């Protein structure tokens, strides 16, 4: 079990479900959740409020396990550069800082089809992040690759349950499932890198 | 595992999460979800549409496990009779019909403080339902009693995640958890009556 957790993206839908789960775990020692908004107070929660990039250096404390639930789209970010800042630069910065704070396991939300050699911009950036994370020196690194699209007609994008909501019945189900999968993956002790694909995340998230 | 499931309240948020979850279980043989609206189609889903009282006698097929996720408030119903319809008459009729269809286990969402001898009308009706269910002849009967309020400030009423003939991000967290608890309780082998209180539901919902 994780003891001291860093959570990036707590105000996204997946992040909110995950944080509420983390706080319910009797063995949880501490969670640090830097965010753009105040979260409800809890004795085990450290919640500095402000922009993530500027908060990361200010973080005191130790961490063993970190989660990154960040993700946007080009449309919501306004440019390829603004998208890269959220989907590449920040997850990398969170990882680098987590290691400095003593972390041994980083769990990151990437996406189905992430591939640095893809012609698809979104998939390419996600793949570039995955490769960059593998160069940071993680004892354990778990990369979740949830489906890019969900809903009855695949009409909703993954980013809507991360950092790019557009205001959600299916959204709450998907966020709940993904958050459950991420916590379950954090219980699995290992060394090295694991990529967890959409069907695996479904079994972990929805299954008993 | 339950095999053939009757679900009342699929249009309420808890029932929505529970239905989605049930349909993902590899061992589920069939779900019958009579509902006030048409639901998304699924090969294992029988979805008669119309007023629940009209639908019940017309249901065909076998059932082993039934769930009832109905609930309103006195004020929303607008009368004692309309409240009793949703919170007493229909859950009782669902149970009666489920037994006729072969059911062995009924799981019902009641409420913290349900007591047929209470002076509080809401508590009295809920307790009267619980007592009446114990007269139907259930081999196994599980009665969940969630807290009346939930959320970061205890600002939401339980009924807002249940089904009525009438939600936000926190509603989704609570509905997801209650649905997880209900399914986990349905996996329990046993005979007789079990009341599951709020603390127990939190533990089962967050951890299972």
UniProtKB/TrEMBL annotation, chain A:
Coiled coil: none annotated. It comes from the Bacteria. Gene3D superfamilies: NAD(P)-binding Rossmann-like Domain. SUPFAM superfamilies: NAD(P)-binding Rossmann-fold domains. Signal peptide: none annotated. Pfam families: HIM1. This is Oxidoreductase. It comes from Pseudomonas aeruginosa (strain ATCC 15692 / DSM 22644 / CIP 104116 / JCM 14847 / LMG 12228 / 1C / PRS 101 / PAO1).
């Amino acid at each position: 079990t994780p003891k001291r957790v860093l959570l990036a993206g707590a105000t996204g839908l997946t992040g909110e479900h995950l944080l509420d789960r983390i706080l319910s775990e009797p063995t949880l020692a501490k969670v640090i959740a830097p965010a753009r908004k105040a979260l409800a107070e809890h004795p085990r929660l450290d919640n500095p409020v402000g922009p993530l990039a500027e908060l990361l250096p200010q973080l005191d404390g130790s961490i063993d396990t970190a989660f990154c639930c960040l993700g946007t789209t080009i449309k919501e970010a306004g440019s390829e550069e603004a998208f890269r800042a959220v989907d590449f630069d920040l997850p990398l910065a969170v990882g680098k800082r987590a290691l400095e704070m003593g972390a041994r396991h980083y769990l990151v939300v990437s996406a189905l089809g992430a591939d640095a050699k893809s012609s698809i911009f979104y998939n390419r950036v996600k793949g570039e992040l995955e490769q960059a994370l593998q160069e940071q020196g993680w004892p354990q690194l778990t990369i979740a690759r949830p489906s890019l699209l969900f809903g009855p007609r695949e009409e909703f994008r993954l980013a809507e349950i991360l950092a790019a909501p557009i205001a959600g019945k299916y959204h709450g189900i998907e966020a709940c499932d993904l958050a459950r999968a991420l916590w379950r993956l954090a219980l699995e002790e290992g060394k090295g890198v694991r990529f967890v694909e959409s069907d695996e995340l479904r079994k972990l998230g929805k299954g008993s």
